[PDB]
Amino acid sequence: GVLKEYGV
Amino acid sequence: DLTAFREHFAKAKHIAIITGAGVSAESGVPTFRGPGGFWRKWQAQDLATPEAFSRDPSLVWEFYHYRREVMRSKMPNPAHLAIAECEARLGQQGRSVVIITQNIDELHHRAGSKHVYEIHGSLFKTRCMSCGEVKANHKSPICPALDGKGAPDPNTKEARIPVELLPRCERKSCNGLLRPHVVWFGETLDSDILTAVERELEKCDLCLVVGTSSIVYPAAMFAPQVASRGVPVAEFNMECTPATQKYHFEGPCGSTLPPALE
Ligand SMILES: *C(=O)CC(C)(C)C(=O)O
Numbered sequence: 112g113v114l115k116e117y118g119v
Numbered sequence: 120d121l122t123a124f125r126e127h128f129a130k131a132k133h134i135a136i137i138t139g140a141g142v143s144a145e146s147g148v149p150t151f152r153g154p155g156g157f158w159r160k161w162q163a164q165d166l167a168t169p170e171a172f173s174r175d176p177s178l179v180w181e182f183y184h185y186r187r188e189v190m191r192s193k194m195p196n197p198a199h200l201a202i203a204e205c206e207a208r209l210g211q212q213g214r215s216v217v218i219i220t221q222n223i224d225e226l227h228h229r230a231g232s233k234h235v236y237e238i239h240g241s242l243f244k245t246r247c248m249s250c251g252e253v254k255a256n257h258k259s260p261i262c263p264a265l266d267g268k269g270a271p272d273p274n275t276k277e278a279r280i281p282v283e284l285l286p287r288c289e290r291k292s293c294n295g296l297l298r299p300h301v302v303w304f305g306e307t308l309d310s311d312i313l314t315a316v317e318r319e320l321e322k323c324d325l326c327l328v329v330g331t332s333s334i335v336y337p338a339a340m341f342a343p344q345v346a347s348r349g350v351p352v353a354e355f356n357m358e359c360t361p362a363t364q365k366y367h368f369e370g371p372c373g374s375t376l377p378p379a380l381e
């Protein structure tokens with residue numbers, strides 16, 4: 112699943 | 120050039136509008152991120168995580184309570200409205216307009232937008248930790264215990280609210296603890312929504328990016344899908360474009376966007 116803000 | 124854009128606008132049958140924090144910012148909504156965006160001693164990154172909720176659920180709810188309350192005085196700006204009315208107007212003519220927003224303040228809904236996708240959820244929804252039911256909730260205060268809490272000044276006392284007095288699921292066989300139905304840092308976006316947004320963005324023949332750029336999350340997930348189809352993309356934000364450069368309208372969305380959509 113797509114980590115919010117790509118996990119940054 | 121506006122003219123160029125308007126020629127596309129007039130032809131377009133399926134417009135998709137992605138909206139970022141810029142448009143909520145112009146309605147005076149704090150995002151609590153970057154220079155002087157503080158709440159008490161913290162910033163959003165520190166509090167908008169499941170770990171923070173686990174460690175200190177009162178404190179997090181205090182933070183979200185405040186955020187829910189400060190929405191009582193913030194209204195939709197002209198960008199929200201122009202979008203909503205545009206949607207309304209084009210719908211009449213069998214042309215669609217969808218909103219994909221990162222914002223969790225419901226301002227597009229209050230402007231009267233209808234086809235809106237809240238990919239990071241909403242301050243005015245709860246999810247139950249036990250049973251997972253998502254319920255719309257605008258109570259003020261969301262629960263008694265929190266009446267008058269959530270002050271921002273760094274020196275406030277913690278309300279250190281017992282966990283059973285924070286908002287609790289009403290289905291009373293359950294009584295689970297509620298959390299804000301927002302996507303916290305380190306969580307995934309709900310994939311049912313992403314599949315719907317995919318479908319919309321494929322249908323789409325004009326794409327607007329407002330209060331953010333395509334070169335950054337979340338617009339970045341998708342704008343490439345649409346640009347690789349030859350669909351025009353128009354950014355409206357307060358970012359500068361280098362001397363040497365599809366469409367970009369620098370300024371406040373409050374000012375730029377309504378002329379554009381009329
Ligand atoms: C992610 O964008 C952080 C959100 C908006 C969910 C928050 O501020 O809690």
Ligand SMILES: [Zn+2]
Pocket residue numbers: 247248249250251252288289290293294295
């Ligand atoms: Zn429940």
